[model samples]
Target: NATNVKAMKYLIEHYFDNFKVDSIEIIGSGYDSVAYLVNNEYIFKTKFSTNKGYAKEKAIYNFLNTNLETNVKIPNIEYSYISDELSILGYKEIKGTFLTPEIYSTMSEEEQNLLKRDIASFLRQMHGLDYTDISECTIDNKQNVLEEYILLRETIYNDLTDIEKDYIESFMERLNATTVFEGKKCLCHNDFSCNHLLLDGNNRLTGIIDFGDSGIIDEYCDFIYLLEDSEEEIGTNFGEDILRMYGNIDIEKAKEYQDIVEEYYPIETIVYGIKNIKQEFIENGRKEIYKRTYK
Candidate 1:
C-alpha cells in the first residue's frame, strides 16, 4: 500500500509544481482512484495502479478537452505523466461539489429544475458532436454488459430461494431480449449519474467530471440513470424538459428504444447491489440485504 501512497504523493507534487496552485486537499476515494482538491479551485484525479488501458483514459480526456472546450465545462488536462516504471497516471483538476444524494434531496424545486436543465444542455451538446466512433475507449458493449450480468446472476442464483432466482432470471431474460442500436450514434457519458455531476452554490451544474467511462454509444443509453432513479414525477418532468431543450432528439426514434431501455437498464444496478451483499456477508460474516430481500 505504501507504493500506492507514494504514487499519490508523486501525482500531487507533479500537479502542484506544474499548475502553481495554492494548496491541495485529499477529498475522497472511489472504486480505483483518489481525488484531490487543488487550491479550492480545481480537482485532480489519478488512478491507483497501472492498468492495461490506462492510456485510453488519458486519450478520452484529451479528446473531450479538444472537442468540448467551450461547449461543456471540462477539466483542462494540465499534464499527465507516467512513471518510468509505469505505476500511475495523474490527471488535471476540475473543480466543483459532488452532487451527493443528500444534497440532491435537499435542493428546492427551482434549484432542481436548473440542475436538470443544465444536464439537458450538456447532454445535447455532447450528443451533437461528430466523433461518434470511440472504439478505442476502454469500455465493453451492451452484449458484454449483459454477459457480465448473466455471470453475476449465475454465481448467486444457486444460493437464492426459488422465488428470488426466478425474479432475477426473468429480469435477465427481458434484459437479453432487448434490441441493440442500429441507428446513428454519438458521443455519450456512459456513467452520467448523480455521482459524476458537479454543482455550485446555486445548484447549477458547474462542471462534468469522470470521462473514464465516456464513449461513443447509443444516445438513449445515456438516459438510463435519470429514467431509473429519479422520483416518478420529477423523472418525467426532467425527461420531457431535457427532450425539449435537446431540440434535435427525434421523439419517434427514442420511443422505439424505450421498451428495451426500460427492460435492461436496471439489471446493472440490481446485480451490483446483490454482489455487494454477497461480498459483505463473506467479509463481515453478516447477512443484511439477503435476509431483507428474501424475507
Candidate 2:
C-alpha cells in the first residue's frame, strides 16, 4: 500500500483500460493494505505486506460473491491479477461508504435500528450458506477472548497502572471461569466492526467489505465488538434485535461469551494503549527511561 504517485498511476492505468477512471483517493490504512476510492463506484485495495492473507480473503469473497447475491451486497471481483512474483493481487473495485464509528454516531436512532436489523439479517443469510464442500469452514480453531487477552497482557504488562493490572487480572480470572459455547460452530466475520461495513444514505447496509481477517469462527466472537464498543443500554437493546433476526444463534452461549468479552475488552484497550506509549517512548529515545520507570 505504498500509494506513492508511481504506484497510484500504475493501478489507475491498469484498470483504466477496462473501466472509466474518475479519480483515486486513499481511504484508510488496514493491517493488510491501504484502501482507495475508485471512480466513486468501487474500492481498490493494495497490499502492504507480502503476506497479505490474500488466499483466505479470495476464498471468502468468491463464496459470498457467488452464493449470497440477492441477500447481501458483496463486492464483485470484476477482475483480479497477480504480480509477476505473485506478491500482489489487484482486486476489482467495490462500491459503498465505509461505516466508521463516527458515521454510525451521526445517524439517528431509527437509522441505527434499521442498520442493526440489516446487519442481523445479513449475518443470518451468510451463516446459512451451504458449506458442505468447504473443508476450512469451521469455527472451533478460531481465536477467542482468552487468547486475545493473553496477547494483550504480554504486550503491555509493564506499562499499565496498578489499577489497570488489577482490573485485567480479576477480569481474566472471571472470564476463565465461564463455559461459553456448546453449539456447532458457524461462519463468522472474525473482524466484524463498523469500519468493515458499508451503508447508504438511507442508513441501509449497502455493502460488506474487508474480508482480510474473515474466517469460520464461533458466532459469539463476532458479538464482542457490539457489546464492548457501544453504550450498555444501546448495546443490549440492539443485541436483542440482532439475536431475533439471527434465529439460529445459541442465545445462552452468546450471553456467556458476551459477559467475558465485556470484562476482557478494557484490558485489551489498556494493552494497546500501553504498547502505543512504549512505541512512542522508543522513538523519542526514552526506552531506557520507560524501563526504569516500569521496573
Candidate 3:
C-alpha cells in the first residue's frame, strides 16, 4: 500500500540530493516488496518496515561487491534508506533478456552446453565464497519446512480433503526420512531460477538478480529450480549436465532435494494462499493435488 510511482518518486528525490525522477513505473512485485523502474535506468525496490529482507539483501550485495570477482553482474546499491516505517534500495538496472526454458530450447546445442557451463561455474564460485562474515544468513530448510507444516496443521489441515491430506502426509513422511537436507551448506542464491537469470544478445548468461532469498543453506538449494520438470524451467537433463560440470557435488542428492521440493509445491501454494487469504491460490493448490494424485 505504501508503494506507487509518485510516492517512490518523492522518496527517491527526497533521499538522493541530485537525483530527479523523469519517469517511474512499477516494474515488478512479490509477496514482500515492490520495485519501480525509474527513468528507465534505476530500479528502486521498496518494502514496508515489517519486512527485514532489504537489510540482509543490502549486506549481501555489499559482500558480493567486495569479495566476488566475476563477469556476471549483481546489484550494486547506490542509494539506500531505512526507517521504522519503510525501506528503499536503488540500483542501476542490469539490462538483459530474462532467461526461460523456451529460450533454452531455442538455442543451439553448443549454446545450451555453454549456458549450462556458465551456470555451473557461477554456482561453483558462489558456493565457494567464504561466508563467515555473514554467517547469520545461515538457514535450515528442513526446520523451516517443518514450521510451515505446523502452521498448516493449525490453520487448514483439518479442512483439507482426504486425498489432499494424504498428499500432505506423504510429503511429510519423505521430509522426515530424507537425508538430502544433511548436506553441505554454502552461501547460495536461494531463489536461483531462470527468471532471475539474465542473458545477453548471444543468449550467454550475463547476470543474476534478486538475492532477496539469498542465504547460506544446503548446497542443493540452488539446483531445485534448474532441475524442475516444468515449462518455466529447463528440464532435469539441463540440471544434470550442470551438476557434472559443477563437480565434487553429489548429483543424486541434488536430484533428491529437487524431488522433495517439487512434492511440496502444491502444499506450499496452499499455505501461501492461507497466509495471504487468496482463495484462488488455495483452490488452485487443491486442484493440482487432485490432478497429480489421479493422473
lDDT of each: 0.61, 0.61, 0.89
**Superior candidate under lDDT, 1 versus 3:** 3
- For model 3, how does the per-residue alpha-carbon lDDT over 1-295 read when each residue is reduced to its tens digit? 3456778788889888999999898989987688999899999999886525688899999999998879999999999987768889999999999998778879999999898999999999999999999899888988988998998989988989899999999999999998998889999999998999999999999989999889999999999988888888888898889999999989989999988888888988888888778888899999999999988
* TM-score computed on alpha carbons, candidate 1: 0.69
* Model 3 ranges with Cα > 4 A deviation: 1-3, 49-52
- Tens digits of per-residue lDDT for model 2, 206-238: 877676666666667776555543532335545
TM-score of each: 0.69, 0.68, 0.92
- As for TM-score, the candidate ahead, 1 or 3, is 3
Segments of candidate 1 deviating more than 4 angstroms: 1-7, 14-23, 39-42, 50-54, 69-71, 82-115, 138-141, 149-161, 180-184, 200-203, 230-236, 247-278, 281-295
Clashing pairs in 2: 43-94
RMSD of 2: 6.2
Instruction: Return the lDDT, model 3, position 17.
Output: 92
